[PDB]
Design an enzyme around this catalytic site. Structure first.
Site, PDB file in Angstrom:
ATOM      1  N   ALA A 177       0.814  -1.217   0.000  1.00  0.00           N
ATOM      2  CA  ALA A 177       0.000   0.000   0.000  1.00  0.00           C
ATOM      3  C   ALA A 177       0.855   1.278   0.000  1.00  0.00           C
ATOM      4  CB  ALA A 177      -0.953   0.002   1.160  1.00  0.00           C
ATOM      5  N   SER A 187       0.904   0.719  -7.560  1.00  0.00           N
ATOM      6  CA  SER A 187      -0.123   0.627  -8.587  1.00  0.00           C
ATOM      7  C   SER A 187      -0.627   2.011  -9.016  1.00  0.00           C
ATOM      8  CB  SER A 187      -1.262  -0.243  -8.094  1.00  0.00           C
ATOM      9  OG  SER A 187      -2.317  -0.206  -9.024  1.00  0.00           O
ATOM     10  N   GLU A 193       0.689  -6.729 -10.461  1.00  0.00           N
ATOM     11  CA  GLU A 193       0.826  -7.928  -9.654  1.00  0.00           C
ATOM     12  C   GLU A 193      -0.492  -8.706  -9.708  1.00  0.00           C
ATOM     13  OE1 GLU A 193       3.595  -7.680  -5.835  1.00  0.00           O
ATOM     14  OE2 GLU A 193       1.436  -7.315  -5.540  1.00  0.00           O
ATOM     15  N   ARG A 227       6.525  -4.979  -8.692  1.00  0.00           N
ATOM     16  CA  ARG A 227       7.339  -5.935  -7.977  1.00  0.00           C
ATOM     17  C   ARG A 227       8.001  -6.960  -8.878  1.00  0.00           C
ATOM     18  NH1 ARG A 227       3.665  -6.252  -3.353  1.00  0.00           N
ATOM     19  NH2 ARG A 227       4.270  -4.718  -1.751  1.00  0.00           N
ATOM     20  N   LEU A 283      -7.225   2.932   3.687  1.00  0.00           N
ATOM     21  CA  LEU A 283      -7.842   3.676   2.560  1.00  0.00           C
ATOM     22  C   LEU A 283      -8.300   2.746   1.455  1.00  0.00           C
ATOM     23  CD1 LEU A 283      -5.481   6.773   2.000  1.00  0.00           C
ATOM     24  CD2 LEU A 283      -7.625   6.655   3.216  1.00  0.00           C
TER      25      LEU A 283
HETATM   26  N1  LIG Z   1       0.497   9.634  -2.721  1.00  0.00           N
HETATM   27  C1  LIG Z   1      -0.704   9.215  -2.296  1.00  0.00           C
HETATM   28  N2  LIG Z   1      -1.564  10.016  -1.609  1.00  0.00           N
HETATM   29  C2  LIG Z   1      -2.776   9.586  -1.197  1.00  0.00           C
HETATM   30  N3  LIG Z   1      -3.229   8.334  -1.448  1.00  0.00           N
HETATM   31  C3  LIG Z   1      -2.441   7.433  -2.118  1.00  0.00           C
HETATM   32  C4  LIG Z   1      -1.107   7.831  -2.605  1.00  0.00           C
HETATM   33  N4  LIG Z   1      -0.565   6.772  -3.259  1.00  0.00           N
HETATM   34  C5  LIG Z   1      -1.473   5.762  -3.166  1.00  0.00           C
HETATM   35  N5  LIG Z   1      -2.587   6.172  -2.517  1.00  0.00           N
HETATM   36  C6  LIG Z   1      -3.768   5.388  -2.124  1.00  0.00           C
HETATM   37  O1  LIG Z   1      -3.244   4.431  -1.166  1.00  0.00           O
HETATM   38  C7  LIG Z   1      -3.804   3.137  -1.407  1.00  0.00           C
HETATM   39  C8  LIG Z   1      -2.717   2.123  -1.763  1.00  0.00           C
HETATM   40  O2  LIG Z   1      -2.190   2.427  -3.052  1.00  0.00           O
HETATM   41  P1  LIG Z   1      -1.796   1.325  -4.123  1.00  0.00           P
HETATM   42  O3  LIG Z   1      -1.266   1.988  -5.360  1.00  0.00           O
HETATM   43  O4  LIG Z   1      -2.981   0.425  -4.246  1.00  0.00           O
HETATM   44  O5  LIG Z   1      -0.572   0.620  -3.315  1.00  0.00           O
HETATM   45  P2  LIG Z   1       0.380  -0.609  -3.753  1.00  0.00           P
HETATM   46  O6  LIG Z   1       0.164  -0.822  -5.215  1.00  0.00           O
HETATM   47  O7  LIG Z   1       1.785  -0.200  -3.380  1.00  0.00           O
HETATM   48  O8  LIG Z   1      -0.044  -1.738  -2.848  1.00  0.00           O
HETATM   49  C9  LIG Z   1      -4.873   3.333  -2.483  1.00  0.00           C
HETATM   50  O9  LIG Z   1      -6.112   3.520  -1.782  1.00  0.00           O
HETATM   51  C10 LIG Z   1      -4.556   4.649  -3.177  1.00  0.00           C
HETATM   52  O10 LIG Z   1      -5.752   5.429  -3.346  1.00  0.00           O
HETATM   53  C1  LIG Z   2       4.169 -10.227  -3.949  1.00  0.00           C
HETATM   54  C2  LIG Z   2       3.693 -10.644  -2.581  1.00  0.00           C
HETATM   55  C3  LIG Z   2       2.606  -9.984  -2.008  1.00  0.00           C
HETATM   56  N1  LIG Z   2       2.175 -10.373  -0.791  1.00  0.00           N
HETATM   57  C4  LIG Z   2       0.977  -9.747  -0.232  1.00  0.00           C
HETATM   58  C5  LIG Z   2       1.063  -8.294   0.185  1.00  0.00           C
HETATM   59  C6  LIG Z   2      -0.330  -7.781  -0.158  1.00  0.00           C
HETATM   60  O1  LIG Z   2      -1.239  -8.084   0.917  1.00  0.00           O
HETATM   61  C7  LIG Z   2      -0.785  -8.604  -1.363  1.00  0.00           C
HETATM   62  C8  LIG Z   2      -0.655  -7.804  -2.672  1.00  0.00           C
HETATM   63  O2  LIG Z   2       0.708  -7.432  -3.000  1.00  0.00           O
HETATM   64  O3  LIG Z   2       0.032  -9.783  -1.327  1.00  0.00           O
HETATM   65  C9  LIG Z   2       2.794 -11.372  -0.152  1.00  0.00           C
HETATM   66  O4  LIG Z   2       2.415 -11.759   1.073  1.00  0.00           O
HETATM   67  N2  LIG Z   2       3.869 -12.003  -0.668  1.00  0.00           N
HETATM   68  C10 LIG Z   2       4.324 -11.669  -1.870  1.00  0.00           C
HETATM   69  N3  LIG Z   2       5.381 -12.374  -2.353  1.00  0.00           N
END
Ligand SMILES: Nc1ncnc2c1ncn2[C@@H]1O[C@H](COP(=O)(O)OP(=O)(O)O)[C@@H](O)[C@H]1O
Ligand SMILES: Cc1cn([C@H]2C[C@H](O)[C@@H](CO)O2)c(=O)nc1N
Ligand SMILES: Nc1ncnc2c1ncn2[C@@H]1O[C@H](COP(=O)(O)OP(=O)(O)O)[C@@H](O)[C@H]1O
Ligand SMILES: Cc1cn([C@H]2C[C@H](O)[C@@H](CO)O2)c(=O)nc1N
Lengths: 241, 230
Positions: free
Chosen positions: A12, A16, A34, A109, A172
């Protein structure tokens, strides 16, 4: 000819969000996401005749099974995570960007984070035992050797966010499976990322990684606040590859 | 590859390693890929865990892990043997001790049927298998199968003769279940797979119930000649 760039960072962190917005800047830029959907809804391929009369049913949720009982389900989840990744990454490498002048494929990743961040952490936490860890690494090694330089990275972009930011962003986003994750778990994953990508002290079985260029970007701010400078940094970084 | 690939199939302790080790000596053109059973009872990279024992002892916990590792190590072994051995031989043959198809449609399948793997584990295993073989399916495709037929009772006796510690508690009814799957696959041909080429692959069925002091000569010659038809 396709340049391969991994976006790395904690759960998070905003990978993405960032990369799928970023990719719009150039028709030569594509992303391999991913396969998280494939983890929360486990399906295998239907027979050619069976799919015409039978629906593709919702399967188990291995992501959730892992979070609920990591000592039982971690090995199964990590093996599947990495298999599904490699399958998706190879297909995009083979089928996309055939008309780009300077094609860049961004991976959400890598097989390296699967092993050296996530699975390694599970091992360290005794969620995988010695036998599971040996098998996992043995498998992971064999599969990497099987490809030549096909998945090898040209560059890594590390999105660095605090454990506290990630915990907030998990909330979020609202993935059901992740709502019980404590800060202590994210901190452990944070430390592994820092060792691997920032301090660069982490040793891997893949020696070219010691020399792969890494761009570290702080993503703690609200998205509007730093996006411009992030894009500028990314473009300058790509110029050097 | 121009290497002929023949699978030797049969139940636990039917006599497959014994047979293939005899066969091998007929020509320098003939090689064998054994199941890496030692790697299963001693887990190591490249004194560790015994994943064979863990599966037999706690099959609802360890079956998936074992089945994944067994198939992974087989594919590794079979591909290595193609890549290096024979090639430049007159009429190369490679004999496989079992195949990726028995891993899945016999062993793993029986585990799913016995509830030793759940739905999620079974679905993951099949997805894993489909993919792992979509890359390496082509290079490992079988030219022929040799089915070594032995009764469940014969197999149970031979498990005792051989003395592998991990196997000494396997009950007759487990062997019966594996037998039925073998017969359905290789004798009745009622077991359907995700690999359509297989329905075409010729099968030589050999009865190995008797002591090898007896009718082994015929069997071996009978293979030598099956391979001439391929
Ligand atoms: N710079 C930012 N400011 C506010 N919200 C963000 C920001 N970057 C990501 N988010 C929010 O945080 C959450 C996680 O983002 P995401 O791109 O899904 O994370 P990841 O792909 O690293 O797991 C989503 O709800 C997205 O709306
Ligand atoms: C790649 C990868 C992801 N995750 C988990 C973290 C998040 O909860 C979800 C999506 O990335 O999967 C995990 O446990 N192990 C991994 N090797
Ligand atoms: N035809 C036979 N007659 C007598 N003993 C046999 C025969 N085939 C195999 N054996 C013995 O039975 C045991 C199991 O044989 P093995 O070749 O290891 O089985 P597999 O490879 O099918 O598991 C070994 O102890 C072997 O010496
Ligand atoms: C291939 C294979 C073998 N075995 C068992 C049967 C024997 O006890 C031992 C050696 O074949 O392993 C198994 O349970 N599953 C497999 N996929």
């Amino acid at each position: 000819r396709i340049k391969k760039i991994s976006i790395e960072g904690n759960i998070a962190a905003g990978k993405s969000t960032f990369v799928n917005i970023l990719k719009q800047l150039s028709e030569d830029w594509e992303v391999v996401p991913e396969p998280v959907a494939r983890w929360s809804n486990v399906q295998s391929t239907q027979d050619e005749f069976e799919e015409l009369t039978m629906s593709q049913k919702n399967g188990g949720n291995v992501l959730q099974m892992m979070y609920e009982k990591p000592e039982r389900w971690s090995f199964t989840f990590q093996t599947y995570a990495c298999l599904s990744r490699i399958r998706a990454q190879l297909a995009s490498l083979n089928g996309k960007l055939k008309d780009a002048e300077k094609p860049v494929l961004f991976f959400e990743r890598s097989v390296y984070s699967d092993r050296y961040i996530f699975a390694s952490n599970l091992y360290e936490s005794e969620s995988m035992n010695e036998t599971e860890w040996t098998i996992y690494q043995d498998w992971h090694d064999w599969m990497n050797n099987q490809f030549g330089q096909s998945l090898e990275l040209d560059g890594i972009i590390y999105l660095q966010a605090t454990p506290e930011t990630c915990l907030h962003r998990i909330y979020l986003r609202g993935r059901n499976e992740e709502q019980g994750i404590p800060l202590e778990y994210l901190e452990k994953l944070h430390y592994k990322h820092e060792s691997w990508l920032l301090h660069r002290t982490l040793k891997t079985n893949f020696d070219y990684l010691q020399e792969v260029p890494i761009l570290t970007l702080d993503v703690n701010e609200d998205f509007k606040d730093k996006y411009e400078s992030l894009v500028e940094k990314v473009k300058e970084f790509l110029s050097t590859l």
